[PDB]
A paper describes a structure:
As with other galectin CRDs, the amino acids forming the binding sub-sites C and D are conserved, while those that construct the A, B and E sub-sites are slightly different, granting galectin-4N its unique binding specificity. To investigate the interaction between human galectin-4N and its natural saccharide ligands, we have determined the crystal structures of human galectin-4N in complex with glycerol (the cryoprotectant), lactose, lactose-3′-sulfate (3′SuL), and 2′-fucosyllactose (2′FL) at 1.70–2.00 Å resolution.
The galectin-4N-lactose complex structure was determined at 1.90 Å resolution from crystals grown in a PEG-based condition that is different to the other crystals reported here (which were crystallised in high concentration of sodium formate). The binding sites of all 4 monomers within the asymmetric unit contained unambiguous density for the lactose molecule. However, due to the presence of calcium acetate in the crystallisation condition of the galectin-4N-lactose complex, the four galectin-4N monomers each contained a bound Ca2+ ion, coordinated by the backbone carbonyls of Phe68 and Gly70, the carboxylate of Asp72 and 3 water molecules. The binding interactions observed between galectin-4N and lactose are the same as the conserved interactions observed in previously reported galectin-lactose complex structures. The C4′ hydroxyl of the galactose saccharide interacts with His63, Asn65 and Arg67. The C6′ hydroxyl of the galactose residue interacts with Asn77 and Glu87. The C3 hydroxyl of the glucose residue is in interaction distance of Arg67, Glu87 and Arg89. Additionally, the C2 hydroxyl of glucose is in hydrogen bonding distance of Arg89. Within the asymmetric unit, Arg89 interacts with lactose only in monomer A, but instead forms crystallographic salt bridges with Asp55 of other monomers in monomers B, C and D. As we observed in the interactions between the galectin-3 Arg186 (equivalent to galectin-4N Arg89) and other saccharide ligands, the galectin-4N Arg89 interaction with lactose and similar ligands may be transient. The presence of galectin-4N Arg89 which can form transient interactions with the lactose C2 and C3 hydroxyls could contribute to the slightly higher affinity, as the galectin-4C equivalent at this position is Lys261, which does not form similar interactions.
Author numbering: 14 to 151
């Protein structure tokens, strides 16, 4: 099983039609975790899409982009699709318009592209979860 933090090159880079399958388990003691779609592996690399479930405060998920080391306008959904201790299936479908986020078969969010998606080279995952597998399809 992959170890954390996980920071992996996406084969051939990100492209439309690709789906990222993440199987994991949310920690019994989960505060946060994130999945980042990252542009390169340099100090201060841009993050085209930051997906950040949070139990601090109102349980929620935060979505954003980091460009030039600055966070953009945050998007939020005040709903939590994960559960402490519970296994989950997290899927990112890459479409021309947005990343479509699906959690346990349910559509959860559509994040509109801010950085051109072909810039993304790496998937990065860290925080309060256990990773079982990550597969790239398409
Ligand atoms: O937006 C993603 C980014 O959020 C940072 O925290 C934000 C916080 O969500 C917001 O409510 C507050 O106004 O500004 C904070 C600083 O930008 C996190 O620090 C970072 O890890 C990302 O998750
Ligand atoms: Ca809470």
């Amino acid at each position: 099983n992959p170890t954390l933090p996980y920071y992996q090159p996406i084969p051939g880079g990100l492209n439309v039609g690709m789906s990222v399958y993440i199987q994991g388990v949310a920690s019994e003691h989960m505060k946060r975790f994130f999945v980042n779609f990252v542009v390169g592996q340099d100090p201060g690399s841009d993050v085209a899409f930051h997906f950040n479930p949070r139990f601090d405060g109102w349980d929620k998920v935060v979505f954003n982009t980091l460009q030039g080391g600055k966070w953009g306008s945050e998007e939020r959904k005040r709903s939590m699709p994960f559960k402490k201790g519970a296994a989950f299936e997290l899927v990112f479908i890459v479409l021309a318009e947005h990343y479509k986020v699906v959690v346990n078969g349910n559509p959860f969010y559509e994040y509109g592209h801010r950085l051109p998606l072909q810039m993304v080279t790496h998937l990065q995952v860290d925080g309060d979860l256990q990773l079982q597998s990550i597969n790239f399809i398409g």
